[PDB]
Amino acid sequence: EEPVYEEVG
Amino acid sequence: SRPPSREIDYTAYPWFAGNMERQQTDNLLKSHASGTYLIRERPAEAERFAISIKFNDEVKHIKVVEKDNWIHITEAKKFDSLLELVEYYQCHSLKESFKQLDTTLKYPYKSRE
After folding, report:
1. Distance of CA B17 to the CA centre of its chain
2. CA of B65 vs chain A CAs: smallest distance (Å)
3. CA nearest to B16, candidates B68, B90, B69
4. Residue ranges of the SH2 domain (chain B)?
């Protein structure tokens, strides 16, 4: 129940 | 006369998606090839817009953060509008922000059903 997405990291 | 500076429509573009679901985009892009990109809307708190791109049969997702009258998906640079953000990645590889990715915007989601 949380936004994963790609993200810069 | 020549300069079309009389109200710009972002929906007119083929890469402008509406209120699409997460599971949908996954299946929709599943049929599409690499290089396909799109931007959907989401009624979230910190995030307002949502971007998606296909690369090596992998549907990636990018969160869009819009605050202080500015738009930006990362926490380093800022943009004046979605257009500036899109055109930036449309020509420049995403590797700059996402080292894991190295693709760019070429074809929309509604290009060929």
Report:
1. 9
2. 12
3. B90
4. 15-109
